[PDB]
Structures are given as structure tokens and as C-alpha cells.
Point group: C4
Amino acid sequence: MLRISQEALTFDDVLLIPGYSEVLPKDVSLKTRLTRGIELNIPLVSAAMDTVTEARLAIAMAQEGGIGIIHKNMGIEQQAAEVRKVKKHETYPLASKDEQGRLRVGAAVGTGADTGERVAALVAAGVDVVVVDTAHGHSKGVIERVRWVKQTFPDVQVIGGNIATAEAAKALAEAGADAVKVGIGPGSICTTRIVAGVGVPQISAIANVAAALEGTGVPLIADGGIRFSGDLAKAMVAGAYCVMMGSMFAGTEEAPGEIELFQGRSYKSVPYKGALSAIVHQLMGGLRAAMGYTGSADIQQMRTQPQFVRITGA
Amino acid sequence: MLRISQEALTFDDVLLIPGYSEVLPKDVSLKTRLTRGIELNIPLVSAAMDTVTEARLAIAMAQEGGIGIIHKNMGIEQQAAEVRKVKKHTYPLASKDEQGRLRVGAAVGTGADTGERVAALVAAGVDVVVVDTAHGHSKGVIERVRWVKQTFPDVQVIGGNIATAEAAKALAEAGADAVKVGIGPGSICTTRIVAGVGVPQISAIANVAAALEGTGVPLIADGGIRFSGDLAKAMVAGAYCVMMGSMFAGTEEAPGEIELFQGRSYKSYRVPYKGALSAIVHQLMGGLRAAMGYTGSADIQQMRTQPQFVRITGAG
Amino acid sequence: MLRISQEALTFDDVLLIPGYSEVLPKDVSLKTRLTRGIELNIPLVSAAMDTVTEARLAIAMAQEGGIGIIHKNMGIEQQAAEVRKVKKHTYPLASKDEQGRLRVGAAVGTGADTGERVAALVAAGVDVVVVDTAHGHSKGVIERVRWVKQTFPDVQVIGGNIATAEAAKALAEAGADAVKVGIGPGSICTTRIVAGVGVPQISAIANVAAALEGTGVPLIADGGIRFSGDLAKAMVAGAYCVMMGSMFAGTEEAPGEIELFQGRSYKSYVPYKGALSAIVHQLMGGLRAAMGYTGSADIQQMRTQPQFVRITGA
Amino acid sequence: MLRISQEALTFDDVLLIPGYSEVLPKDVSLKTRLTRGIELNIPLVSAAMDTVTEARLAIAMAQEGGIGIIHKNMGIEQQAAEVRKVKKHTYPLASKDEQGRLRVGAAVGTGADTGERVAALVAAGVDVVVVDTAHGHSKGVIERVRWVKQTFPDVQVIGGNIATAEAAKALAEAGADAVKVGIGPGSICTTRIVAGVGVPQISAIANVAAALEGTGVPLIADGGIRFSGDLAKAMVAGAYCVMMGSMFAGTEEAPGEIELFQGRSYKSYVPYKGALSAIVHQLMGGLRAAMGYTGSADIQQMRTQPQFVRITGAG
């Protein structure tokens, strides 16, 4: 009577099958949704990590057609100030903008004592989306905080996470979440897996959440386990609306830290990776190629039509 | 055709699925049972190995809220003397008997002088006798367990090692107050290489747990635990507690004396020096509490019976 | 739910089961077809790669009883001139047309000047035109295959690359005289890492073979072949023949000139591998041994009768 | 339509499950059969390889209670002379014929002079002729087995190598007194790499054992055995005994002479491995331990009663 719910698959267990194709990679549409109310021109979000997203990188992400979530490892007023820098910034045709033409930005909040105050300062600063973001989103604290943000600040979008199950997705949707963020123990050597023994392989987690939210209009953001552009394509076909990147964007020019030379190589103080735009271009190129192979003219087709093969270790 | 009973899974084949949670890691209850009659405040037991448990480490384990099993690689009177040091020795979780003395166990085999060893250990005040061999599903172990229960009814008796439902029932029938689970648990064990014998530990624990459900007989998971994550998995598979061996070897409290070699610290009697036992216990507990937080388990009973696993591939 | 088409197997997932045998390896027949109209005495084709097939290696492949496909990384007139060298050039197995000239093929893409390239190749006497791209299940390739068949009915045309039953039928319906099978066939392929796309080659071959059964259209297995054992497995999975690339690069006949570097021999424009005939002899030896083990007297039996066991990682 | 017959398992895919035990490892019986007519006191046979079995090692194997198969990479008279040395040669388990002489086998192929070789070996007193090729499920091996059985009805004959139920039945039908199982049994073997051919050895043994059940024809597991644990697994899958090759190469008794090279010992014509008896003792110890764990009092019980679990890579 070992209680095994299912066999769960990760990115390396699957490959996308080619299908009949008419639309070239350069001509497919990458338009998607972050939340019920926020559209993005490319399906990429930068993580709320202190080595990844502050105002500078959030601006660059919005300009590329994605969005940045400003991290919460700073004071309330400091975080609000970062949001303000993004909202007040003055050739980028794909730029993610609100109704006033200002760049979009998100900000992360936890569930600790001063969260209510943090949310109010972020909303007053013009934040587009508040991400109620903890290790365990299927919990009383996160569900209640999501509900509170939705009831107190009905004009801001709210994202809840992190989750990995159909049941958690429904609980957050029911609490009023405008999107959910998917990813608990998504990588092989994650702390969560080693220390706690907890996780769900990310391809199955995405598919389980996608099936649970089908017909609700609530997007899901895949957060974790993405190493190559090929994994971005697989995440979308599994049902993600977009994908959150973390350490992949750390060390870029726009990310926090200053450049440092050490033993004939460049680092930030993590290798120095140059302009964010070059990494985004490569990730997009790979997604466009995959859409070319699967014959998917747009994101809606990519999420719903192509098939996987499951493969062995060999 | 080929007689395959089942596919058997080990710790790395599975992960725990998060569930709805209301209780914080710091507030979950870790209380459990070692045996029908012995409660522990944390689910950890130190192994009866000569590099792990003598009086000193057994005292520290009892103080932490677990228990130590004193090894039998010593004379009868020496082993009895080790038990006495524990029984005659602030720590609010301390494992104590009805007289307020620290709890301790002691291992015995099935060889010629076992009866005499058991009598000296019982006279020394031992709380539990572990009838401990490579193969507990055998006439010798089953008979010795029965003998200890009948001769010394005030002492708790643990039988092992086993890996099957049928072995668990035979030991429960013989009067065992708990069973110890682990035969060829883990990849490069001698038992697997030399004899070709073993059962992956997650399946072994689940098979024994299902066999003993409703009997009140605890099962102790012994072997294959490398990280705190494995401790959580062992509990959800059905273990009541977990026995650690080489993980505690090299701690200050373990046998051996500290030795410096090429700028590093070791214990000497090969093993790295690991500092205070309390730091390792704190890490292991932290991990279990985090897992109970993720699965939404408020106590050990919920952790053992409610959460689910997902099975993963090599790529995971 | 997660849209999985199947579990797909590669060469290392399977082994051939021995069967009752009466015919010695040296006596089995290796005769097969490249296309509806072209027979080969051995089931080997050299890839249209610039480090593999120009006139010199194409001549040697034909002489061995196989065929070479001249690469297209050169001007139209240059490629035509390479075909002419082959057509105008003791070898009892030699692959020859009705006029007694050595057979040769030539690759073309789907870009602006393909029509002009095809016409020059056909005028040069090419036996088969390979319409060869990363994604054969596409409007561009299907239309180009149809165009070659309609405009030049007397030349054989091969379409590819494909990995599915549906793609095989689309190319057969467009008039292809054979199809070429292989998309993301190897472990560390760019297609898999960058795009997340591929089908393990044993399953791709079987799926295409089953789709084309009774049509008279051959399939050529292209990719993932490292040892002679893989050649035998490809044939039992349903391939009519197998295309080799980098395995033939560095042979005396392949492009490049020999170069000495740090006490070893290389080719330059890759280890020096000696005469093509020695590699062909090894590959054939292995296929003959496999036919001996399976009891297959000829290629038709090898493709249809023997069985595999599936094996684990261990 | 990929023609997959089954998933096939090797030694590392499985482990033996402990069962109720009453008999100690030192007290279990290891007696088994090589063929319909030849009993052995331990289930071990040395392979017909030129780095493994000539007269010297064959004598040592018989003395241990097993048997050696003398290799055929030598002239007919030379092979006959090796058999004679064994037949004309403190060891209570020794494998002996009715005349009290040590048992020995000898390998033959299917080439031009096989009939003459078999006759010389039989006249030299060989106990069993092993008709031994890469592919036993073939016209040549089946016919040769039948010929040996018809021409020399008083000698035992073994046919191989095979890996399927159907091949086992064809050899049993031809009159084989035992079959030898193993085609592409190891991971990096030539047959797999060059030809793409093989059957993982645990499945091959079980498939052959099921096909021969009730015929009285033994099966010998040949290949893929690296540890004593694999010997136990081979028996529980249905083998009657196990043939060892390179594991015995480099022993004192095996062919070659000892050579010192860079402070280590090798044999020269491979590490030097000391006395054969030490390796046999270790292999037997492991089998006895496994019989202790499974509760099997003898070989018949070990082959028919214990169960496996199947395990993953992580296990």
C-alpha cells in the first residue's frame, strides 16, 4: 500500500514531435498572458531574486516584451522606489506597457508580519502585479493573503505560488488569483528535494495545473528547471502560458551586482553574461524553431496541439 | 516463467507531493514510538555499531529525545557496564523511563551466550533488547525474540533485520515489540554484491507497514538514509522511526578519539570528525519538519498515513 | 492531460534476438532499394555533407555497391560538375544506371535558386535529387518534391527529413520515390537542446516503415548510427538502407587533405581514417553477422522477420 | 509495429527477496546436474577458452566438485592428450566417473574435422562433448548434436550457445543432454556492438528454463557473471549450473606463465589471481549465503522457490 499518485516526468523525459508546418519560425506569434489582465509579447518573466531582478533588469525585460518581478529582499520603501523607477522610465516595439503607456512591472511579497504594508506601498507605486510568492503556495497563509490582496486592491493583478498540483491550482483560483506560479522541487539537486524530500517533476506539474485551470481563464507561469531553450518550448506544450527564468539572467549587465575581473575572466559581485537581450534572443530563437517544427502558428496552438514522445535514459 | 514479486523502489525513485498546509514546521509534533511501550520525542535511533553507539553517544541520543542501541562487539560485563553508565547518568525532550532515568537499548545476536548476555543487560536496567542479525526471518531470531519476551516480560524486545510482510508478521507473532527493516538497503552493500539479496528500502518499509497496520507494532527503518529528505520519505512510507549509523560515526560523542591527519580531523580506533551530535540531529529534524510543513502533516501519525509520493525517472 | 503520443526507443534500448539459422553470413544477400527505381547491392548511402561526399567519395560509394549524395554547400555549376565527374568516370557490385555509368545523387534545399539547381543537376545526369531540409513535413518541402516529380519525371526524388507516419504519407502523396528519416536522432543534437524536438530513431524508422508498407516507397535511415550493430537494428526496424555521415569523413576519398599534427593524421579544409573500403567492409561484416544470428537470408527477411528485446539501462 | 518480443532483464535489474530460513549457509546442499547423466557437487563449470581450461585447470575443477571443458583451439591429438591427462591423474567433493577417474569435458565446433575430433575425444575417455558455437540455434549445431548422440550414445552431449525457448526445444529434440545459455550476455560484448544481437542473461535463463521444464534436460548459464551474487541470481532464474570464463583466467592452474611487470603479477601467453580454490571458495560462500537468505536447503529449492524484486537504476 505504498501511496504513489503517479509517475511524474521532467523536461529530459520528453521530446516534441514534429508536425505539419506552414509558418516559418520568424513569423509565428509569441503573444501570451501573464495574468487574466496582463498580456506579454514574449512568454518570459524574470524571477524575484536579489541576483536577478531590480529596476534596471525589470526595465529591460519590459522592453523585450516580457516582465520583471522585483525581489523583496529589501525594505518596503526601497522596493516601492524600484517599482517607481520602472513606471517612470522614458526603439522597443514589443515593449510591455500598461494603459498609460508605462512599462509593466511586478513585485514579490511574502506572508510575514508587514506584508499588508508592503502590498499597499507597491500598489501606490503603480505596480502592475503583486506576486504572493513562497516556498509553499498551497497553504492557509498564501491562500488568505491572495484573497486579501484581491479584496483590498481589486485593481491590481495578483499571482499566487508556488504550487505543483491540480488541487493547489483550484484553491488559488478560488481565492481570486489572476495567475498561478508552478514549481516545487523542480530541479535534480534542489535544496527542497535533498533537505525535505519534496518535489514534483516540472513537466507533469505544469500539465496537472494546466488541466485543472482549463476554462477558468487563469494563466500558469512555469518557474524552475529550465536549462536550455528546448525546455522553454517543452514547458509551453505542457501547458505553461509563460516561463520564469532566474539564475539564467543573473550575471547579465542589467542584473544586480558590479562587473569584476578575476583570473582573466569576468564575474558579477557568478559569470558575467553580457546583455540580457542576447540571452532573450537565443531563448526566443529556440522557441520559434520549436513552433516551426511543431507547426504551431501561435502560443495558443503551441500549448494545446503538439505532442510529446516519452524517451528512456538511452 | 521469471518469478518477480514486484518492482521495488528506493529513496531516489520517489518524491513527496506537497499538500494543503496549515501548521508551520516549527509547530508540528515529532512524537512517535520505538516499540509498543517506548515513546520517543524525535524519531531517531543510533545504530548498534562499534563506531557509533557506546554509553556516551547513547546518553546524548536519549537527551535529544531519541535512543541509542549499545553495540555487542564487547564482553557481556563490558556491555552491561555501558548500559549502567546510561541508566545512572537542561534537556526537556529527554527519553526517560518511569524512574526518570535515561533510556537505552542494547544489541544481542543469536550465538551460544545470548541468554547470559540478555540476563546481564536486563539486570543492568536496559529498556530494550535488540535481537539483531543479518536475517531476522529465521528460526534462530524468531525463537530468541520469543524467549526474551517470555523470560523477561518487563523488557521491550526488537527483532530484525527484515524486509517482507511475512517476516514482519512472524516477528509480531513471536512477541516482538517492534521490528527493524533493512536487508540490502542501498546500492553497493555487501549483501547485494556477495549474495544477490536485498529489497529497496522504500518498498520494504511500505510492505512491512501494511503488514503491521492495526497491530500496534512499530517498525524502525534501518539503512539507506543519506540525507534528511530520505528521513521524511521513510516516515511517509510507514516507518515510525529511523536508525542512523555511519552518519553519527565521527561525532564527538561517538567512540574513538580525535586525530589530526594532513590538516583535517578524523576519529581513530578512518572516519571524518563531525562535531557535536546535536548539530547533525538539528539538521535532520529541520528537514523532517520542513517536509511535514510541505505535506501538511501536523504530527507523525498524519505524516505516516496521509501524504503521497510521485515516482520519478533517472532523468529526475 | 499531458499529450504523449508514445514511448519512443533508440538503438541502445533494443537488441536483436537470435533465430533459427541456415545461411552463413558470407552467403546472405544484401541487395536492397534506395528509391522506387534505384537498386543498391549494399544498404549504405553517404551523406550530403561538405566533409563527406564530393565526386571522389561518391565514385567510391557507387563502386562499393552503394551511392553518394553530393552536398549542396557549393555553387550550382560546381555541384553539376561534381555530378558530371561521377557520371563520366574491378568492381562487380558497382551501382550503375542503364547506360553503365556510376550512380550519384545530389542534395538541394528549398531556397530561392532550388529550381535552377535541380535543372542543372538533372542536365548533368544525376540519378536522384534529395530535397533535404531540417523539416520535411512542411509546405515548402512537400511542394518542392511535387514540383521535381512533375517537372522532371525521369529523375528519382527523395524527400526529408521526417520522423512520423503522417509526414511519410504526405511525401509519398507528393510523389517522393523515397523518404529520409531522422529528426533529433542523437542524444546531444542541436535540435533537441535548442528546440526540444526529436524522435528516437528506432521508433521513427518503425513508424515510417509501417506507414509506407505496400506503397513501394523506400525509407533511408539518417542519423544516430555509431556502430555496425546499429546498422543491423535500423534494418530490422524497417529501413531499406542507412545514410552515414561523419563516420565516412576523414577517409582518403572524403574531401580535405591529409595533415600531420602532434604525431597523428587528420584531414583539413577530424581524424584520418584510411580507405573508405575498410570502413564499408567492417559495417557490412557486422550486418552479415547479424543476419547470420537472426537467420535472415536477404534484406527483405531482415526487415520483416527478426524481433527485438527491449533492455534497461543496467 | 516495432517487433518487440519482451523486456529482457539482466543480473543488475533484479535482487533476491529473503524468505523464512531454517538451514545455515554451511549446511545447504550444492549438488546439481551438468547433464542428464552427470552430477556435480558444486554448480560451477570452467569455460572452453584458451586462457582458461586445459588439463591443469580441468583437474583442479573436477577436484573442487565441478568440471572443466577443455578448449578446442589446438590440434585434435593435442586436445585428446589434454583429456587423457585429466582421466589418468584429500578431495572429498571430487567429480568422478564410474571408474573413479576425474570428469572432464571438451569443446568441438561444427567445422570440417569435427567428427574426427569428437571420436578422438571420446576414445580419450571424455565425459561430455560440448558442441559449442556463437549460434546454437542453427542447422549445423542441431545436426552435429544429433550426430554425436546417434554415433556415440554412451557419451553426454551439450549443445549451445542459445538464448530462447525455441532454441532450447530444438536442441532437446536433437538429443542434447544439456543446453548452454548465453548470446550477447554482457554490456560491452562484441556480439552486441558489432552485430546488435543479444539477450540479457536473467531473461534468457528463465525463458530456457521454462521451455525445458519436465524434459530432464539441464541448462548451463554461460556469461555475464561478475560477482558471486550473480551466481545466486542465475540459479534462482533456473540455471542448473554456471560456466565461468575470464574470472578463472590468470589463476595459477589456468594456462600461461606468471610474469612480473611494474611491481605486479600477470599471466603471459591478464592479472595473476592465485589459486583457483580461493576464487571457488568465494563464489560458493556467496551462493551459500544467498541460499541462507532465501531459505533454500538445496539446489532444487533454490531454482524453483525464491522470488526476485525488480529494481530501477537508482536501486
